Amino acid sequence: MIGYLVDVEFVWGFQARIAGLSKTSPSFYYPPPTTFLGAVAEAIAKDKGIGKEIISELGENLLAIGWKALNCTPLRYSDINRILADLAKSFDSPARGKTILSSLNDEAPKIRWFLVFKEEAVEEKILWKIHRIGSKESRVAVVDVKKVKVTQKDGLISTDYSFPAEDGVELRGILSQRWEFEVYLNPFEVKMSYISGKKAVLYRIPIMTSIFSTPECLVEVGGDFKAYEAGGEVVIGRC
Amino acid sequence: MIGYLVDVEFVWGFQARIAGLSKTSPSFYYPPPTTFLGAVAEAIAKDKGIGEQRGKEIISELGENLLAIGWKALNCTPLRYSDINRILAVAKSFDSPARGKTILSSLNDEAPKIRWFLVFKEEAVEEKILWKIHRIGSKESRVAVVDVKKVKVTQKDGLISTDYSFPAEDGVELRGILSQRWEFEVYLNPFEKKAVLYRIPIMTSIFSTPECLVEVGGDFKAYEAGGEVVIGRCS
Known part of the structure; x- marks a missing residue:
C-alpha cells in the first residue's frame, strides 16, 4: 500500500463535461475522480509518448x-x-x-x-x-x-475527505456541516461486490462554509470497504 | 482620429480590487476602464518587439x-x-x-x-x-x-x-431609454477629475439589447463607426 497527498491550486475552477452523461450528476461541486485520474494518466503519457490505457x-x-x-x-x-x-x-x-x-x-x-x-x-x-x-x-x-x-x-x-457512499459505508453522524451527495463515474477497476465494477458511484462530499470549519463526519466502515489512514488523514476506499 | 473594436471572451468573470477605494463604487458590474487600459499597458510592457523606454513612453x-x-x-x-x-x-x-x-x-x-x-x-x-x-x-x-x-x-x-456605456457627466444628457437596463457605476477616471460616473448597459433578456437616446454637446462628443457609437471627450 502507498498513499499520495496532493495539494492542487486552481486558477478559477473547472469544467468536466462528463456531467452530460446519463450516469453522472448533471452538475459537479468537484472534479470527478476519473477526471483527476485522467490528469494523472495524461501527465504520465506526456512524460513518455502517446492511449493510455494508463487510466x-x-x-x-x-x-x-x-x-x-x-x-x-x-x-x-x-x-x-x-x-x-x-x-x-x-x-x-x-x-x-x-x-x-x-x-x-x-x-x-x-x-x-x-x-x-x-x-x-x-x-x-x-x-x-x-x-x-x-x-x-x-x-x-x-x-x-x-x-x-x-x-x-x-x-x-x-474523516474530512469525500467518500463513496455504498452498502458497507454508513455515515453515523455529521460533526461539522455541509456534506453533499454527488454521482460520478466509478474510478475503481477490477483486474469487489458493492463497489464491484458498477459504472457509477455515489459519494458524500464535504462543502466548506467557513475558512475555519473543515467539514467532518463519523463513518462506520465494513464489508467491501476500508479506511486508510496516514497520521490524521483518513480516506475511505475499497478493500 | 482612430478607433478600436475589441471583443473579449471571459472564462468566468473578473476581479478588480480597486472596488476597495472610496472613489469607486463598492462593487462592479463591469471591469473598470482603467483596468482595461491597465491590461493594454501590460501587453505593451511585455512585448519584446517594443523597446523598454519606448514602451514606457507609449504607456x-x-x-x-x-x-x-x-x-x-x-x-x-x-x-x-x-x-x-x-x-x-444562510x-x-x-x-x-x-x-x-x-x-x-x-x-x-x-x-x-x-x-x-x-x-x-x-x-x-x-x-x-x-x-x-x-x-x-x-x-x-x-x-x-x-x-x-x-x-x-x-x-x-x-x-x-448608443448601446455602449457612456460617462454621465455635465454636458451629456439622457433623452430616453429605448430598451432596458441601464445601471450607474463609478470608476477611476481614465482620461488624461478623479472618478467618473458612467451609465452602463445590462443585458437581461434574450429579446432586447440595451439602447438609449442621448443628447451630447459641450466637452463631450459621440464617435461613430458604422453602427457602433461611443460617447467620449472632445479633442
Missing part, C-alpha cells in the same frame, strides 16, 4: 480516492444561473459541469486529494506535472505532493 | 491620447459576488476577499463576451498588441481576445442612440 491501469491499482477543499467553496454555474432568476440549457449545455471555486481567503482556491494504491503506481515527480484537471481551461498548479505509508482500518472512523 | 501617453472608452455585453449578464454572498450567508467575511469580484454568465451558455470601443487622438497602439491581452483585472481574471478591428471614426454631437 484503466491506475483504476485497477486504486484502493481509495478522496478529496477536500482547503480554503474554498464551489459555485456551480447551475447555482449561478439560478441566482440570476431559456432552460434548454439544462440539457447538454456548452457549460455543463462548469464550476467556479470561490476562495474563502486571499489565496487561490485549493483542493487536497488523498489517493491510495495497492502498490507504487506513479512516480512522485509525475504528480507535480499536472497542469489541468478537466477541460483545457481548467488550469492548475500542484503545490505539494507527499508520499505516505498508510494503515488499513475498519469500524468507526472520523 | 505614459495612453490616458492623454484617449478620447473615448465604452463597452457593452454581447451575450452575457454580470452577477456580483456581493449578491451571491448575501444569499449564502457576508462581510465572504465579501472581503471578493472585493470587486463578479461572475459573467452567458445567455446562451457560451463564453461570455464583452466588446470595448476605444477611440484615440492618434494610433496609440499597434493592433497586434491588443490580441495579446490575457487577463483583465486580477491574474485569475483570464480572457481571450477573439476580434480586433481598427476603424475610422466620425465625430458628432446632438442626439444619438
Whole structure:
C-alpha cells in the first residue's frame, strides 16, 4: 500500500463535461475522480509518448480516492444561473459541469486529494506535472505532493475527505456541516461486490462554509470497504 | 482620429480590487476602464518587439491620447459576488476577499463576451498588441481576445442612440431609454477629475439589447463607426 497527498491550486475552477452523461450528476461541486485520474494518466503519457490505457491501469491499482477543499467553496454555474432568476440549457449545455471555486481567503482556491494504491503506481515527480484537471481551461498548479505509508482500518472512523457512499459505508453522524451527495463515474477497476465494477458511484462530499470549519463526519466502515489512514488523514476506499 | 473594436471572451468573470477605494463604487458590474487600459499597458510592457523606454513612453501617453472608452455585453449578464454572498450567508467575511469580484454568465451558455470601443487622438497602439491581452483585472481574471478591428471614426454631437456605456457627466444628457437596463457605476477616471460616473448597459433578456437616446454637446462628443457609437471627450 502507498498513499499520495496532493495539494492542487486552481486558477478559477473547472469544467468536466462528463456531467452530460446519463450516469453522472448533471452538475459537479468537484472534479470527478476519473477526471483527476485522467490528469494523472495524461501527465504520465506526456512524460513518455502517446492511449493510455494508463487510466484503466491506475483504476485497477486504486484502493481509495478522496478529496477536500482547503480554503474554498464551489459555485456551480447551475447555482449561478439560478441566482440570476431559456432552460434548454439544462440539457447538454456548452457549460455543463462548469464550476467556479470561490476562495474563502486571499489565496487561490485549493483542493487536497488523498489517493491510495495497492502498490507504487506513479512516480512522485509525475504528480507535480499536472497542469489541468478537466477541460483545457481548467488550469492548475500542484503545490505539494507527499508520499505516505498508510494503515488499513475498519469500524468507526472520523474523516474530512469525500467518500463513496455504498452498502458497507454508513455515515453515523455529521460533526461539522455541509456534506453533499454527488454521482460520478466509478474510478475503481477490477483486474469487489458493492463497489464491484458498477459504472457509477455515489459519494458524500464535504462543502466548506467557513475558512475555519473543515467539514467532518463519523463513518462506520465494513464489508467491501476500508479506511486508510496516514497520521490524521483518513480516506475511505475499497478493500 | 482612430478607433478600436475589441471583443473579449471571459472564462468566468473578473476581479478588480480597486472596488476597495472610496472613489469607486463598492462593487462592479463591469471591469473598470482603467483596468482595461491597465491590461493594454501590460501587453505593451511585455512585448519584446517594443523597446523598454519606448514602451514606457507609449504607456505614459495612453490616458492623454484617449478620447473615448465604452463597452457593452454581447451575450452575457454580470452577477456580483456581493449578491451571491448575501444569499449564502444562510457576508462581510465572504465579501472581503471578493472585493470587486463578479461572475459573467452567458445567455446562451457560451463564453461570455464583452466588446470595448476605444477611440484615440492618434494610433496609440499597434493592433497586434491588443490580441495579446490575457487577463483583465486580477491574474485569475483570464480572457481571450477573439476580434480586433481598427476603424475610422466620425465625430458628432446632438442626439444619438448608443448601446455602449457612456460617462454621465455635465454636458451629456439622457433623452430616453429605448430598451432596458441601464445601471450607474463609478470608476477611476481614465482620461488624461478623479472618478467618473458612467451609465452602463445590462443585458437581461434574450429579446432586447440595451439602447438609449442621448443628447451630447459641450466637452463631450459621440464617435461613430458604422453602427457602433461611443460617447467620449472632445479633442
